[PDB]
Amino acid sequence: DFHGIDIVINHRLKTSKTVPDLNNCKENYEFLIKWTDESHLHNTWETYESIGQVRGLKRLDNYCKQFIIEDQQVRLDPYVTAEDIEIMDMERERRLDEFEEFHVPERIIDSQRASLEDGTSQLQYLVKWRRLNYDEATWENATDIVKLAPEQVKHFQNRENSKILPQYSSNYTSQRPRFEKLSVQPPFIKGGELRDFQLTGINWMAFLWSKGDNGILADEMGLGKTVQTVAFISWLIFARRQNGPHIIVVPLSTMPAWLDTFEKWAPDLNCICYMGNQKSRDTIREYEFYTNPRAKGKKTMKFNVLLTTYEYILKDRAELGSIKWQFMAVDEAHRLKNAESSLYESLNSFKVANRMLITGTPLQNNIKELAALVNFLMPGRFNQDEEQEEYIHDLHRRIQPFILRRLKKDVEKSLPSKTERILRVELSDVQTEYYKNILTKNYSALTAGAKGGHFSLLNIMNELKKASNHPYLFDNAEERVLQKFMTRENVLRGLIMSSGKMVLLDQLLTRLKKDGHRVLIFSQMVRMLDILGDYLSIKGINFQRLDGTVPSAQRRISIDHFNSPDSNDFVFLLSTRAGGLGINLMTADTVVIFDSDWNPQADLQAMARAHRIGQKNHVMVYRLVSKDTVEEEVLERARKKMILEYDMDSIGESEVRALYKAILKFGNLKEILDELIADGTLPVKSFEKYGETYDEMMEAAKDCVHEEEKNRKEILEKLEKHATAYRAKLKSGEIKAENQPKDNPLTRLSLKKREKKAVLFNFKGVKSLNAESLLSRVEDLKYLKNLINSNYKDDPLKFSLGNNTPKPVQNWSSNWTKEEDEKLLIGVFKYGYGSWTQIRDDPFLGITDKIFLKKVPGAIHLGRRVDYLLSFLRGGLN
Amino acid sequence: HRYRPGTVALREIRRYQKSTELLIRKLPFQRLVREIAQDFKTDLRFQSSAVMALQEASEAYLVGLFEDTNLCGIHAKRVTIMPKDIQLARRIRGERA
DNA sequence: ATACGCGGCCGCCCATCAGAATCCCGGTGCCGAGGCCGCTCAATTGGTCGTAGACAGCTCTAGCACCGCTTAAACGCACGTACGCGCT
DNA sequence: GCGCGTACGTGCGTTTAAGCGGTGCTAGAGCTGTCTACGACCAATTGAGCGGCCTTCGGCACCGGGATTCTGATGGGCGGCCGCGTAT
Ligand SMILES: Nc1ncnc2c1ncn2[C@@H]1O[C@H](COP(=O)(O)OP(=O)(O)O)[C@@H](O)[C@H]1O
Ligand code: BEF
């Protein structure tokens, strides 16, 4: 809550020897300080005698300590090379890059009007910033919010106004609406056009959507599978009017893709995710509800779509279980492999109506999953040499519906070709020693004998396999092949040499190196990847590693750095499960395999990340098959494994009470029918039923108005008729002017004309509806809407009074001048009569501390202000 | 909660008592055994429980130790378990010489 | 040229209609006796033989008691030193 | 560490009772000898007990509908705006 130091951003010199001391930083260095409990934007260049003891002293001191030594390792030493200068500077560069993106705001969460110490109340917006999670969103006032990010605020208003919540969805539960085959691409795809194998896919999902059955998407690894669901989500929303909060669970690795894939292919439905911890946990709930707590299940509804990591499912199984869901999406749904899964019966509790898995999981490896998939989508529903025909007569006829099988033979015609080469590498020197001695406890027990015991089986069928091609995976291996007792050439040579694979890779790599191909290494084991991390840097090839140990933010930075047009590193190393985890590589052509990934198909996706629709450089694949080892056999079983691959009644008085107020506020409301219904103001009735009632209601309004006027008109003529008759006597002298009767016609006429009494009628619901009040505002607003529309269309605010003079308001508390009126009118033109906080807060109007809803003018003062101006400039007071 | 002096000291004690979860982790312990068990014989296997059981034994074994240690410690005008406090306890029980 | 009229503005008490919140009645999930039961292999049943062990006879060790001459060991008290234990 | 206090070790004299070897007595262990009851064993029949498998009501803690209370725009009537405005 206090003003204390939060972090370090930037460091610079303050003033015009061998090592700067802290004093030098205090009397020669200025440092940019970000303050605690406050967004990035308010950063100050401050020293120590400038601020004194402030809570939090620790980060600057160390950072200065880092700074002091940094200074000794860029300019103050001759052991420094050319490249360290590059990194020591570089850090300055990147440290700011991760600091810059916080200034740009990314979403406005809510809007609160809070009071100040001068007695004023100002609008503040909860602002969310770029590539950061929901925490540390601090309130900022609206004055500059639109002054830097107008687009966010525009969109901020749009969602709140676009009444399309899960509150109006069509009752198709009992039964469905006949659905239609689409030819054309739906007027809801802004991202572009898709092709001739992405709209039909969609037409099947939506086609069995109307059956009450769920389906399996089994296409190739990356045939615009994601676009097919998002479009599937889009057309189930503006087709069958389903506002039903759709739940989608995707991988923590593959979601950021999805979001952009969701926010660029379909603007109009907003996408709020679930990816936080403790604090987030609250912010999700802030917007996940309306009006704080809610009796029953009466949440007003502020989202439809969400994205959930697989973690988070299980951490909070309960809250989702209660809320209803009827549509399910999941990414790479080969997870449900066994029927003993935790997410396998975790998903079953979430009251659901239709599901949607979408993965290319081969479904013949084990019959368990084949059955598990069928049991999971449809709880309840389920060899011999000569009964096999009988068997696939049952299996082919039943399995197909909830299945999709379709080959590339699509979009691959442009994409450059695919290819893979095997490698027969025979054994080495130190290699046999540990291919031969390890299958016993001879010299495996002499050196590292204590560990021998636990790894002894590890080494047999789940190591030899893994430690057959490369023996460097234990301790007593490194010096074994190096034949000497610091050397730099020899270590590089000694390590390349031991393995058949290391040399083969080093030469091919070199071979394409000069030709220009980007090469990929998929290794099964974490460490192999450091191993190479150590060698390739040494020989000077720019790279980055892709392990199982990396923050979402850090993972994301490099993946993009790599696919950018002008990236130097053609070497990129990845994991089997961590590599094929998700993502895509579109720049890459070559991929090389060290060892098969104890299984058929982990490789087939492993190449899928690199071999995708985009790649314009054919493709290249190398498999390093070890000879006279144990690698060979699995490779054969692997083969064995993949051998098979197959009207609401009428409007009641209260609505009539609802409609009447809305007209005084918006005037003709026939155009705005749905927006009001979406939110509280109106019940769901057909468009005409309201529209006709709207018209007769005025039709009732005028008839009373005219009839009354006519009657007074008739009497008024009668009184003047008498009035002249006296007038003759007055100048004749019969009655003298200075002595004329208390009561005489002149007085009777005066009271009669100065008649003041409201004009009233009934309307089968309301009591004594105001006839004149309705007729007067409907027309006055119609006129203001008409003039600015035909002269100030593109920009409302330029609106000007010019010469015409409306009354001066001398004694009102605050500055009042013609410009303020100019805005006041635009304000209603924008929000409607009678909502004035709306108008006062608006960042664009600039009226914010001139309104006081002893301080004038308040709510009625303005109400008085507009009726007078609008009549005035049309010539109504005639 | 009064002041702060010796405030948690007795607090944690109580919460730990009401609970009944293992004091020591159940992952380091698991290898510790596998590792020595090799030195006395080769090609070893382990029942899931067998360790679970040892953990139970051992934990319980130490607490018990400490429990006396404490007394000894008190005897001494001290609230501090000491390196020897351990020894006496054992010595008089008799495993320690 | 000079005096009268007023006009919306406004504080005022005074009236109407919707929304918030407490009480009157509630559904839901978890725990622990119940029931059902059924193939079956261990106890029970009826039964024979023989052998431990109860039991009575007997004798023959050793546990008790008892005494008095002899004296080492216990007793109680006097005096001071060198530890228990309290404080810092 | 140090200093105060006192209790417990070391001595001598007085005193009390163990230990010694002496005899006598009979109880209770140990032996011995005959009978027979009770336990092992083998047989055949029967249901208590174990694996296998899924039951139902009650209790903790989250819930549900209806009258009622408090906040907001509405409105005629008595007063005040002092400043532009028409008539003689
Ligand atoms: N059907 C499609 N129409 C147009 N562009 C597509 C289509 N499918 C994919 N893309 C483009 O290709 C890229 C990756 O899509 P895709 O290959 O389906 O994802 P994944 O890596 O999951 O397979 C996206 O950046 C997208 O712009
Ligand atoms: F179809 Be993907 F790998 F997100």
Would you write up a description of this structure?
The PDB classes it as motor protein. Keywords: Chromatin remodellers, motor protein. The structure is cut from a larger assembly and holds chains A (878 residues) and B (97 residues). Chain A is of the alpha/beta class and 878 residues long. Helices cover 40% and strands 10% of the residues of chain A. Chain A is built from 31 helices and 19 strands. In chain A, the strands form 5 sheets. Chain A has a 6-stranded parallel sheet, with helices on both faces. Chain A has a 5-stranded parallel sheet with strand order 7-11-10-8-9. Chain A is elongated. Chain B is mainly α. Helix content of chain B is 64%, strand content 0%. Chain B has 4 helices and no strands. The N and C termini of chain B lie far apart (46 Å). Chain A binds chain B through residues 441, 450, 452-454, 456, and chain B through 34-35, 38-39, 42-44. The structure holds adenosine-5'-diphosphate and beryllium trifluoride ion. Adenosine-5'-diphosphate (ADP) is lined by residues 192, 194-195, 198, 222, 224-227, 584, 612-613 of chain A. Beryllium trifluoride ion is lined by residues 222, 225-226, 254, 257, 582 of chain A. The structure holds a DNA duplex (88 and 88 nucleotides).
List the SSEs and their pairings.
The structure is cut from a larger assembly and holds chains A (878 residues) and B (97 residues).
Chain A: E1 5-13, H1 22-28, E2 29-35, E3 44-46, H2 48-51, H3 58-72, H4 83-100, E4 105-115, E5 121-129, E6 139-141, H5 145-148, H6 150-161, H7 200-205, E7 215-217, H8 225-235, E8 247-249, H9 255-263, H10 279-288, E9 306-308, H11 310-315, H12 317-322, E10 328-331, E11 356-358, H13 367-377, H14 388-399, E12 421-425, H15 429-436, H16 449-461, H17 478-481, H18 489-497, H19 500-513, E13 519-522, H20 526-538, E14 543-545, H21 552-563, E15 571-574, E16 590-593, H22 602-606, E17 620-626, H23 631-642, H24 653-666, H25 673-678, H26 687-732, H27 745-753, E18 760-761, E19 769-770, H28 771-789, H29 818-831, H30 837-841, H31 859-874
Parallel strand pairs in A: 7-11, 8-9, 8-10, 10-11, 12-17, 13-15, 13-16, 14-15, 16-17
Antiparallel strand pairs in A: 1-2, 2-3, 4-5, 5-6, 18-19
Helix pairs in contact in A: 24-28, 26-27, 26-28, 28-31
Chain B: H1 9-18, H2 28-40, H3 48-75, H4 83-93
The complex binds adenosine-5'-diphosphate and beryllium trifluoride ion.
Chain A binds a DNA duplex (88 and 88 nucleotides) through residues 295-296, 654, 657, 661, 756-758, 767, 807, 811, 834, 859-861, 864, 868.
PDB class: motor protein
Keywords: Chromatin remodellers, motor protein
Entry title: Structure of two molecules of the chromatin remodelling enzyme Chd1 bound to a nucleosome
